[model samples]
Target: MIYDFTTKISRKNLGSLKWDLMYSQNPEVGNEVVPLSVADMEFKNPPELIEGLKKYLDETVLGYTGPTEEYKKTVKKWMKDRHQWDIQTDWIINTAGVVPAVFNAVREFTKPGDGVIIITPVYYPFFMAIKNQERKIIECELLEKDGYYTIDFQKLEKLSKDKNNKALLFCSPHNPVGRVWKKDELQKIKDIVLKSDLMLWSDEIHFDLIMPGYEHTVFQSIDEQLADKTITFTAPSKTFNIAGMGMSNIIIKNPDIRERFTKSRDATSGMPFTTLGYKACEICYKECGKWLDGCIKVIDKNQRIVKDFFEVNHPEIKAPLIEGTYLQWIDFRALKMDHKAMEEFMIHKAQIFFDEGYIFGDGGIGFERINLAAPSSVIQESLERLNKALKDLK
Candidate 1:
């Protein structure tokens, strides 16, 4: 049960975006971009994943294909086994990536010039995915009290009462703030959406990433109305560290909505996970994932590593309540820097490249997101560099 998530893997030139691209032929990119900036990790693929892919590649056939019955059964089993939710075989529609599916889902349910509700200091990409389509944004900013974040449903209700926003780009077990929304909050969100024109789009790519003692609630499974009004976006990419393989299982129960989404997204394609990607899911979600108890433990420990560091060294920097995801949001308000200045200072002084807060919108000022999915050694080094720069910098 002791999965070795602690082992360090060098991603220097594997064409890794987190490592190679940031460094871009300069081995010193480590000095310039200790890239906690992206939401990926540097872990090696699990052994079973490798074996499964090998079997797949050996078959040596590639063609335009769709999800097989095995794929649906596995997904249903995954939901039941992992989140305790049961989805019908017909509910799942195959897509390439979670983000693209999100865009298509929004386009399917909502209209252009209409707003999509979202929380701020979010994954940031959620905002871009909406705005890029000429859609409006209805931000129900999360309320922060002593580092705990909660949905401001009063604000959500107030804003959504008119139902101007037709969709929600929900990052459940949200990013940036990192709170796995309690059932009541999710219920509240469901209530608001049901009363309005809003359709909930749950981005549960990080569903399996919940920390020790915490669990995630699939919005669709929580209530009949929520399920009817929502679509679940999930992938093995984030769970099993195969993001380059873009396939996503976009689960929705409503036939009408699925058809609309299919029509609207004319040019989009599902992630064609190389021979490895498909088999990776089967092995990871079916066989190796039973070992996820071990993976979660590693991520939990890694999260604490950053938490303890921030607690001891930088009271000014607030770390998010890491319920899920290797990505941790760090608030630098006490550092008293604007969003742009914070980015510059962290890069210049700490020699670290983290996803800037402002990219999540103006609310991200004085904050930066951290990726803790790396080995403890790398995470420790990044934090150490940050500590040294914060203590020594003028």
Candidate 2:
């Protein structure tokens, strides 16, 4: 397979928050900085998406706009083709992004003091999203055994039984720890949440980034009862290298629930998509997704690099099995550094910024989340940095 994943794209002056954030904060770290922190990828958008956006920009009509028929078609096709789930066009509501969509659902579905549950060593923003919306975070930490994370359903059920636990933010093919919640696991979650009358916001953002032979199951698509109490938040942004585009669509099948959330979201401000955001998603979902196959293949190749590096060198710091997402959750606890010092060492020694494991509220003391969505060569460079920095720990 001749993968074109080697090309490097410079993100310097283009107002890239991922690159510029570090450079602007500490110019001394300029050029020496190799950021693997943020979820943004270091890849280019597909040629089909780029050309489609260019054509749309030529129209010169950038203003408040509604979603087009073609936009609905694109989203519908994506869900059906990828997940084998037929999602109605009307069920989809556009959002500026997934984080905001999660926020909106928390406000609309749960009370101020209600609880939002998430598996720990998960996404960090979810912790903030729960608190920011005045909802309590009920962390049902995943049990790490044999270098793999398994859902602790018993604990999760106990957490759900809390009357305050009114919502759950589900990260399918979860970020950080890249476990694709198997259907049986998801079903287990649904049974508990449904029994407790808790709503679920299934963040299926990384659904398409699964490792080979692994498939993701949609929560709503499983059963109508689950659909009645679920909202699916997904986007092509992460998959297509269009994070700057900032467009995500929420699938709310339940009318009352959808209305409540949509109204609360609309009360805030402008339309979900900017001109380019709308064009990028439509074109990428419809036309450019074919190119994504190559992208995922590259990511899977990079995954092996990360896995093999850990297997050979840092045997103690085992990597959790990654079913999806170009992210690696490395257990660095063998070095015996607590979360705070692990963070400091990232800057002072490795010169790499990774998501601290503790922030995910999993008591993830000696762990770090590494993003592997860069070029294969860059992935190799990061491996060298990691290996050299921790070589003495043995």
Candidate 3:
């Protein structure tokens, strides 16, 4: 409670995508209506982040910027301290965002007509990164049973046998269906990729947001061989609600892969460090662990509230608490609505805004991903409105 997680910051006119989308779609909805569609939090960032940036701006120059030695050291220390992963300074590549990093990696590692394997229902951008680069998408869908999701090693093994399959775009502690893969599970994936000679781009952006009781093992840190063949992308954006900072650290252990990635990255205009982004990141990584812990506590509570609300009022709807990330993946299949009808029901009937599950790819239809990184009152109000709408349908 040292850091405030209760007060909702007003982002109405701040060009907030989540907020703007809600108003645009339902222009007539009340002023209090807030969208839970986006992955970013509704809470303010840690005080250290804000204060550090303010101090930096007041004393330092805002000219063409790059990561400082202190920032790089802090980044290295954070990886070691928080995730038990060690890295050399040369292995870290600065990028504006993870999405672009994914795009660049896909281009750098694979060629046209090659296959990039992905597990679906996953983040939609995974599909775009492959398809947009003229690469074929090899789908390896997860097996879901009784509201839990697990990887299908059998299907993955089959897909890996194809010579055309070149790489795997992996989402750890996956986005919509939030399963934090155990160490043994990651080992299984490593075995598959190594057997097939496939490269791995393990997106561990959600690594720091793990719920209490569950642990997140960095994909590369699992084994020395895995480390040699993996490119891990991580950021403080999701962890500290600083997505706007436009900064991410791409950790690559393999020298050849790092060289190729750097060449590919330099071919484009590329992004340099922002004065504020580095300062904010440096402060957060060094001083904001307690704030992150407090933030996760609030998210954990909000998730339970959503789960209990559904269990009590709409028993047919399955809203399970996730092991990581603030997104709550709920199954609305019991409503018997197609994707279009599902959208209409949520927008018009319930007046609720969520990331429609269908966007995440196959096995995600008839589901909704709710952003739980908000104040309790905001979540409770949305759920209350949804309960009334569900009752009205009956």
Candidate 4:
């Protein structure tokens, strides 16, 4: 059951968004240039998943599909076993992806002119889901102390009072700044949503990627009342490196809320299922715990590599280890460069492509988020190049 996390997969000329973007930025850069931007991992999929897919293809017919009873059982089991959250199979609605689900929730639950509250510097697609739907984005930026990020409850409360701010697009084990919200914090968020009568979309896609000594609590699992108002989005995509499969579990406990989302999906004729997508997720949850654990260990090691690299080679930059997810957020404001200049520096100078901090929102400027799910050697090379780049700046 030993997974190989050290081997680098060649994704070049494969239409990978991360690699394609890197090549687009610097078409002349060699294959050694690693783009640590997108959230997807560069590692191979779990052996079980690949083998299961082959077995399925051999016997099963590939047709238009929906969630099977077995798939639902695996999903329910995963929620309870991994997250300690017991969810009814009835609450699970299939989605093409979490980002699309967020878009659906935004359109289904709120009016065009109403506001959707988000904690910035968050995943960028959160902004897209709101703005693309012609809704207002109410940004309640998180409070950053040292390198840790936390919710600004006072500001959140003040914004929630606005009648137009009808929903909250919450990121658990938040992206960019990766702090897994504790129970007390979840309780506070639940209280605010309940008091304000705001719809809550909990994007817990990275729920299964918790680092050592940390746990992720599903927001709806906080209480029955919270469940009533919350829509939880999760997937094996991030956990198992299967984003290309395009599947997600959107959990909604409230009947009315679920109905609305379903209606919106149907109105758009959203085909929520893929034959391979469900099979892959089911196989992953039922049999790939060891693979996930191996991935996490690699990510944890890579995170420490980044942190140590910055600490020793460039003390001006602050790269803190995250509590969850493979994304490592590092502070680069010490260089005193605007995000535009920073992007250019990393792309053309450092020869490493990172998710520029500014894209997440105003709070993210002068920061960089790197994908740590790459090989240790890849990470080492990236850090060495980065060190040389920073040294050149001096």
Query: What shift in Å separates residue 87 of candidate 1 from its native position after superposition?
Result: 0.7
Predicted candidate 4 versus true structure: per-residue lDDT over 128-239, tens digit per residue: 9999889998999989989988889999999989988998999997998888999999888888889987988889999999998898888888788878888999988999
Q: What TM-score fits each model?
A: 0.93, 0.94, 0.98, 0.98
Name the regions of candidate 1 deviating beyond 4 angstroms: 24-34, 270-276
lDDT of each: 0.76, 0.80, 0.90, 0.90
lDDT of 2 by residue, 119-158 (tens): 8877878988888867788888788786688888899889
Model 2: per-residue Cα lDDT at residue 323: 85
Candidate 1's TM-score reads: 0.93
Measured by TM-score, how close is model 2 to the native structure? 0.94
Candidate 2: list runs displaced more than 4 Å.
1-3, 24-27, 30-33, 392-394
RMSD of each: 2.3, 2.1, 1.1, 1.0
